[PDB]
Amino acid sequence: CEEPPTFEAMELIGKPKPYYEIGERVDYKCKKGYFYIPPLATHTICDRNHTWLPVSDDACYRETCPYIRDPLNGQAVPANGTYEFGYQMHFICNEGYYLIGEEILYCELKGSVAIWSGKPPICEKV
Amino acid sequence: CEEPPTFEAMELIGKPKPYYEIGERVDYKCKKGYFYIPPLATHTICDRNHTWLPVSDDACYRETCPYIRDPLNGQAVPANGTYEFGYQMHFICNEGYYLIGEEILYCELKGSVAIWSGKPPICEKV
Amino acid sequence: CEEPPTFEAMELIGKPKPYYEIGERVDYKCKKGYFYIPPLATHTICDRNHTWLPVSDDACYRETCPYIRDPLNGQAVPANGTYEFGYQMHFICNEGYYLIGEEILYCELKGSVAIWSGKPPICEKV
Amino acid sequence: DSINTLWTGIKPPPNCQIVENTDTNDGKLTLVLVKNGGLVNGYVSLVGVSDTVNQMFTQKSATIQLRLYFDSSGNLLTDESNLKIPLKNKSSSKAFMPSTTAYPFNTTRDSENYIHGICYYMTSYDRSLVPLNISIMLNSRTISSNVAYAIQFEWNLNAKESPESNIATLTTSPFFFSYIRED
Amino acid sequence: SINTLWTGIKPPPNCQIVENTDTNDGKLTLVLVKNGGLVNGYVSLVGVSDTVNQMFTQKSATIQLRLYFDSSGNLLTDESNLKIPLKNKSSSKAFMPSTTAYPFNTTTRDSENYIHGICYYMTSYDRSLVPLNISIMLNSRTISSNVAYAIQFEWNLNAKESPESNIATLTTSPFFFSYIREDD
Amino acid sequence: INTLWTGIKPPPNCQIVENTDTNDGKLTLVLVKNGGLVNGYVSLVGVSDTVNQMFTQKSATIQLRLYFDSSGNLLTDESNLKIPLKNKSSSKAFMPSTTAYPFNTTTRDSENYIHGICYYMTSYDRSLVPLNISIMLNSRTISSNVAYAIQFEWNLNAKESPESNIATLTTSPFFFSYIREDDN
Numbered sequence: 001c002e003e004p005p006t007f008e009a010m011e012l013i014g015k016p017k018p019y020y021e022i023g024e025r026v027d028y029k030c031k032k033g034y035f036y037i038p039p040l041a042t043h044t045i046c047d048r049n050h051t052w053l054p055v056s057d058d059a060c061y062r063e064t065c066p067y068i069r070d071p072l073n074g075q076a077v078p079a080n081g082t083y084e085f086g087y088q089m090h091f092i093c094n095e096g097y098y099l100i101g102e103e104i105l106y107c108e109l110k111g112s113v114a115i116w117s118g119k120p121p122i123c124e125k126v
Numbered sequence: 127c128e129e130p131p132t133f134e135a136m137e138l139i140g141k142p143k144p145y146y147e148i149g150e151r152v153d154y155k156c157k158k159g160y161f162y163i164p165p166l167a168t169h170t171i172c173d174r175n176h177t178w179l180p181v182s183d184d185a186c187y188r189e190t191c192p193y194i195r196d197p198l199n200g201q202a203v204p205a206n207g208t209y210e211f212g213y214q215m216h217f218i219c220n221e222g223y224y225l226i227g228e229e230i231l232y233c234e235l236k237g238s239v240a241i242w243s244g245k246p247p248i249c250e251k252v
Numbered sequence: 253c254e255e256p257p258t259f260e261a262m263e264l265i266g267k268p269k270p271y272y273e274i275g276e277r278v279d280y281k282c283k284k285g286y287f288y289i290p291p292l293a294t295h296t297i298c299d300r301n302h303t304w305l306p307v308s309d310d311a312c313y314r315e316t317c318p319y320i321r322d323p324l325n326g327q328a329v330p331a332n333g334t335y336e337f338g339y340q341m342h343f344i345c346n347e348g349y350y351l352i353g354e355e356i357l358y359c360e361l362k363g364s365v366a367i368w369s370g371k372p373p374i375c376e377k378v
Numbered sequence: 379d380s381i382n383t384l385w386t387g388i389k390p391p392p393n394c395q396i397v398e399n400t401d402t403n404d405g406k407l408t409l410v411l412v413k414n415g416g417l418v419n420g421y422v423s424l425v426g427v428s429d430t431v432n433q434m435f436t437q438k439s440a441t442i443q444l445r446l447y448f449d450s451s452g453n454l455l456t457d458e459s460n461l462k463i464p465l466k467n468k469s470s471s472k473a474f475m476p477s478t479t480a481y482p483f484n485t486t487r488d489s490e491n492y493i494h495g496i497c498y499y500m501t502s503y504d505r506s507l508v509p510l511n512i513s514i515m516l517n518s519r520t521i522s523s524n525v526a527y528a529i530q531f532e533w534n535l536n537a538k539e540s541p542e543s544n545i546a547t548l549t550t551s552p553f554f555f556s557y558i559r560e561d
Numbered sequence: 562s563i564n565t566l567w568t569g570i571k572p573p574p575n576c577q578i579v580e581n582t583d584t585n586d587g588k589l590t591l592v593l594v595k596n597g598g599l600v601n602g603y604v605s606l607v608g609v610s611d612t613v614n615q616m617f618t619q620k621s622a623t624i625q626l627r628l629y630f631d632s633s634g635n636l637l638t639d640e641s642n643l644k645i646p647l648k649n650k651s652s653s654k655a656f657m658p659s660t661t662a663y664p665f666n667t668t669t670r671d672s673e674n675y676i677h678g679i680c681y682y683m684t685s686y687d688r689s690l691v692p693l694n695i696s697i698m699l700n701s702r703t704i705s706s707n708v709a710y711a712i713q714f715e716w717n718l719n720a721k722e723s724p725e726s727n728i729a730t731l732t733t734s735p736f737f738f739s740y741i742r743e744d745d
Numbered sequence: 746i747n748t749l750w751t752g753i754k755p756p757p758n759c760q761i762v763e764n765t766d767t768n769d770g771k772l773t774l775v776l777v778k779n780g781g782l783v784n785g786y787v788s789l790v791g792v793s794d795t796v797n798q799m800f801t802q803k804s805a806t807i808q809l810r811l812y813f814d815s816s817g818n819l820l821t822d823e824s825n826l827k828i829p830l831k832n833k834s835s836s837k838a839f840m841p842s843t844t845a846y847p848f849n850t851t852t853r854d855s856e857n858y859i860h861g862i863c864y865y866m867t868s869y870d871r872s873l874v875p876l877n878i879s880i881m882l883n884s885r886t887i888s889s890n891v892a893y894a895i896q897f898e899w900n901l902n903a904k905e906s907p908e909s910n911i912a913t914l915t916t917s918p919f920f921f922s923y924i925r926e927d928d929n
């Protein structure tokens with residue numbers, strides 16, 4: 001068999017049949033926001049019984065924002081440790097220095113790409 | 127013969143000779159602002175006499191402006207010709223609606239292209 | 253020998269060795285802002301002694317600014333008279349006319365290109 | 379010419395899906411890919427078929443993104459792609475795909491994988507021009523075990539005010555490009 | 562095996578730009594190359610006459626050269642602004658714009674028939690750049706019974722203020738293009 | 746022998762900063778023979794820190810110039826490109842025609858430049874920043890050896906700097922075409 005398993009990261013490819021036969025193959029693709037990394041499977045088959053083979057959406061990962069170098073004379077630490085869309089980045093300035101412009105940046109998802117909600121701040125010399 | 131006939135829509139191609147000979151052909155091209163549509167004649171030929179054959183500039187038409195869909199909840203009706211340059215377009219708004227911005231647009235000729243002298247109006251809901 | 257001669261127009265090609273052998277060859281290229289014209293020498297060699305052969309940067313000429321036509325109803329005369337960067341251009345307006353905007357323009361060198369430090373003036377009719 | 383051109387064909391039928399959720403083809407994508415040395419020459423224009431698509435330019439800004447995926451052979455995976463009709467020669471298609479060493483498949487999207495430029499939309503009423511931002515991502519992002527090559531086209535409208543006031547056939551000026559091809 | 566159709570490198574005054582002119586006042590360099598189902602294009606323009614080289618003393622100007630061809634693919638030198646036939650680098654039909662791709666219309670004037678882009682003019686005094694709007698209409702509109710193919714080039718100046726103050730050689734940056742070509 | 750290039754994904758192969766001894770740029774160049782023309786593909790990647798800091802300014806400029814001998818071979822000594830080009834398998838066939846883009850002693854023909862725009866993708870939000878690209882063909886020469894020349898010049902100029910910290914400079918691929926020599 002029946003409707004193939006549903007997942008969080010990947011979805012089905014093509015019209016969902018009410019009944020699948022033994023032997024036939026069903027394929028998945030990553031959902032909007034996720035991307036695929038080899039070589040874990042993205043498909044599954046109807047076994048000699050009438051259940052589906054094992055299968056996980058581990059092949060699909062959450063989109064990531066670009067790496068951010070510590071501001072000069074500063075320090076850029078992920079506030080959740082992730083670079084995964086949804087989580088943010090915290091900025092701290094060293095001794096004898098002060099930050100200018102947004103000590104926190106969000107990693108938001110815009111379309112199919114994950115980007116930062118701003119330009120990394122500066123650490124100024126006091 | 128002598129100088130070939132002149133027309134409104136099409137003109138002569140090449141240096142006009144003071145005297146053309148029997149059987150000699152002369153070709154026309156549409157003037158700036160007009161365009162040609164098959165398969166009508168666009169030439170004449172010096173007949174066994176010393177006059178030119180019949181010939182008209184019907185092969186050349188006026189440049190047309192783009193089609194204009196009835197404004198939503200409105201109605202775009204032309205005033206005269208097939209969106210031919212020179213003639214204009216009238217706009218009327220349905221029941222319970224009112225127009226904003228120019229209930230008439232001209233189809234003017236600018237260069238070699240025929241365009242509308244404005245953006246089609248809106249029909250608003252009152 | 254030792255470090256090859258230095259010049260205004262051309263410079264050395266490659267790492268300057270502290271000691272050049274006897275009979276060893278050294279090549280020059282024109283500096284940013286100058287360009288080469290045949291067939292004068294660009295090189296020098298270490299003679300049977302321990303000095304370098306004769307050699308000049310005459311092979312390299314200065315970058316020229318674009319030609320400037322006499323302003324309409326005016327006259328554009330080079331004042332130092334070179335067009336090479338460094339020298340300037342004077343503008344004089346004819347009888348019954350007056351200049352607007354900078355009666356002198358400099359031919360300055362910006363980067364590798366020689367350009368004029370302004371837009372040529374106008375000669376107005378009084 | 380020994381198989382030189384891979385394209386959608388001249389003046390094609392509705393052959394792709396532009397609107398997010400639907401199954402009826404609402405776009406006419408003209409794509410022409412030509413082998414030339416180590417490079418591929420590209421020609422890509424778009425035409426709107428559906429009403430919902432031809433309304434997109436009544437907004438101050440819109441965005442259209444078609445992505446094509448290919449198998450290891452170089453054949454369109456019609457299921458995953460927004461392009462619903464396989465490419466064909468003008469007469470493997472691997473020779474036409476974007477080199478994997480040039481524009482890799484990554485696990486984070488090299489700026490080195492995008493092509494960027496500008497094509498134009500002609501208004502309906504006065505033929506005036508409106509800049510559309512075109513951008514082509516080569517490979518870089520895979521969504522299935524089948525994918526071996528990928529090309530993504532993204533058109534972007536963004537203007538002080540909307541180009542159209544009513545619905546009208548969306549058409550993107552032909553945008554030319556080139557990339558280092560597989561072999 | 563006959564790959565290039567062009568005007569030739571560094572050509573003589575070979576076209577008329579000023580409407581109703583007595584002499585060729587433009588040097589049009591055009592290079593069309595066969596490549597698969599496409600043609601690669603290269604087109605630059607140089608001003609010859611004084612009247613043309615004064616055009617850029619205005620805040621805005623416009624230049625439009627249109628080439629027409631017969632069923633064979635040969636320049637109809639009489640109707641065209643280009644007054645010297647194209648030649649191979651060694652039918653020219655193989656080089657023309659496909660009729661199915663960019664039709665000849667009697668009504669709509671397809672937006673699908675234009676190519677649009679931007680090339681540049683270098684000023685005389687400081688070499689600075691001024692954007693010119695280039696647009697190439699393929700086929701679309703015939704003006705005579707002879708016409709079977711058409712290419713129209715249109716350069717457009719439009720700036721807050723004029724580029725030049727005196728007369729100076731008008732030159733358009735090379736603009737590259739491509740179109741779907743006809744095929745015997 | 747159809748392609749002349751630097752090769753795919755090359756090693757640090759050119760010098761961008763004045764007075765260095767360590768290649769700090771990865772220039773990808775692909776030149777393809779096509780009829781009477783050459784098709785060009787050129788992207789740039791920053792290697793050194795000093796180069797990858799250039800875009801913390803409101804504006805910067807990068808200029809790589811390649812020189813060639815009469816054979817069509819890179820004069821690696823004079824050029825900013827420090828590694829010879831190679832075929833994909835004379836290179837004269839690939840050089841810019843001398844009659845099309847002459848070597849001048851008087852002026853610098855505006856007819857010798859190609860002009861366009863490619864783009865830089867920011868580090869944090871992937872947004873786009875226009876870079877002015879300009880390619881000078883031949884025209885000037887700084888050596889008795891030089892017989893052909895190609896000069897690439899990228900130019901940043903924005904209301905405010907794209908980056909606030911150091912980040913890998915990468916120029917969008919810019920495509921071009923020129924009339925090629927042809928030995929003969």
Ligand SMILES: *[C@@H]1O[C@H](CO)[C@@H](O)[C@H](O)[C@H]1NC(C)=O
Pocket residue numbers: 079080086087088
């Ligand atoms: C990310 O970390 C910060 C720490 O300041 C926290 O406020 C925020 O809620 C975290 N986000 C999520 C989704 O947990």
